[PDB]
Amino acid sequence: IAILNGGNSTVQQKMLDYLKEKKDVGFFQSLAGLMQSCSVLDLNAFER
């Protein structure tokens, strides 16, 4: 977030080029896993 703050096109392009050159499905799989494991509000714990 700190490096990409303001939507720096240079950094965005460098990340895209790195991902394209080094085909890394693991990065997207890790992102999917993180957003799947992100916590949400649960009523049972609040009642406890």
PDB file of C-alpha atoms in Angstrom:
ATOM      1  CA  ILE A   1       0.000   0.000   0.000  1.00  0.00           C
ATOM      2  CA  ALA A   2       2.782   2.429   0.899  1.00  0.00           C
ATOM      3  CA  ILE A   3       4.660   1.881  -2.361  1.00  0.00           C
ATOM      4  CA  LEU A   4       1.513   1.904  -4.539  1.00  0.00           C
ATOM      5  CA  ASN A   5      -0.101   4.896  -2.820  1.00  0.00           C
ATOM      6  CA  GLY A   6      -1.408   7.294  -5.444  1.00  0.00           C
ATOM      7  CA  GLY A   7      -1.590   4.608  -8.132  1.00  0.00           C
ATOM      8  CA  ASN A   8       1.975   5.010  -9.396  1.00  0.00           C
ATOM      9  CA  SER A   9       1.896   3.763 -12.978  1.00  0.00           C
ATOM     10  CA  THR A  10       5.614   2.937 -12.958  1.00  0.00           C
ATOM     11  CA  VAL A  11       5.237   0.537 -10.034  1.00  0.00           C
ATOM     12  CA  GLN A  12       2.026  -0.921 -11.457  1.00  0.00           C
ATOM     13  CA  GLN A  13       3.752  -1.585 -14.783  1.00  0.00           C
ATOM     14  CA  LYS A  14       6.776  -3.128 -13.073  1.00  0.00           C
ATOM     15  CA  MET A  15       4.572  -5.499 -11.070  1.00  0.00           C
ATOM     16  CA  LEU A  16       2.615  -6.456 -14.190  1.00  0.00           C
ATOM     17  CA  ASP A  17       5.786  -7.076 -16.201  1.00  0.00           C
ATOM     18  CA  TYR A  18       7.273  -9.195 -13.420  1.00  0.00           C
ATOM     19  CA  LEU A  19       4.115 -11.300 -13.175  1.00  0.00           C
ATOM     20  CA  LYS A  20       3.964 -11.748 -16.951  1.00  0.00           C
ATOM     21  CA  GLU A  21       7.637 -12.701 -17.310  1.00  0.00           C
ATOM     22  CA  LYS A  22       7.654 -15.063 -14.311  1.00  0.00           C
ATOM     23  CA  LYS A  23       4.341 -16.891 -14.664  1.00  0.00           C
ATOM     24  CA  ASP A  24       3.251 -17.131 -11.018  1.00  0.00           C
ATOM     25  CA  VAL A  25      -0.159 -18.705 -10.492  1.00  0.00           C
ATOM     26  CA  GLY A  26       0.858 -19.069  -6.850  1.00  0.00           C
ATOM     27  CA  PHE A  27       0.531 -15.321  -6.303  1.00  0.00           C
ATOM     28  CA  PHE A  28      -3.096 -15.290  -7.450  1.00  0.00           C
ATOM     29  CA  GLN A  29      -3.810 -18.484  -5.511  1.00  0.00           C
ATOM     30  CA  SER A  30      -2.374 -16.843  -2.391  1.00  0.00           C
ATOM     31  CA  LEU A  31      -4.548 -13.772  -2.940  1.00  0.00           C
ATOM     32  CA  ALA A  32      -7.626 -15.971  -3.344  1.00  0.00           C
ATOM     33  CA  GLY A  33      -6.769 -17.882  -0.177  1.00  0.00           C
ATOM     34  CA  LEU A  34      -6.251 -14.678   1.795  1.00  0.00           C
ATOM     35  CA  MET A  35      -9.547 -13.138   0.700  1.00  0.00           C
ATOM     36  CA  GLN A  36     -11.252 -16.458   1.446  1.00  0.00           C
ATOM     37  CA  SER A  37      -9.769 -16.598   4.957  1.00  0.00           C
ATOM     38  CA  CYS A  38     -10.578 -12.947   5.719  1.00  0.00           C
ATOM     39  CA  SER A  39     -12.805 -12.845   8.791  1.00  0.00           C
ATOM     40  CA  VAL A  40     -16.347 -11.464   8.897  1.00  0.00           C
ATOM     41  CA  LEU A  41     -18.774 -10.558  11.661  1.00  0.00           C
ATOM     42  CA  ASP A  42     -20.027 -13.588  13.597  1.00  0.00           C
ATOM     43  CA  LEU A  43     -23.042 -13.302  15.882  1.00  0.00           C
ATOM     44  CA  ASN A  44     -22.301 -16.356  18.045  1.00  0.00           C
ATOM     45  CA  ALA A  45     -19.023 -14.947  19.362  1.00  0.00           C
ATOM     46  CA  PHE A  46     -20.676 -11.600  20.076  1.00  0.00           C
ATOM     47  CA  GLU A  47     -23.462 -13.330  22.014  1.00  0.00           C
ATOM     48  CA  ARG A  48     -20.861 -15.248  24.023  1.00  0.00           C
TER      49      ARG A  48
END
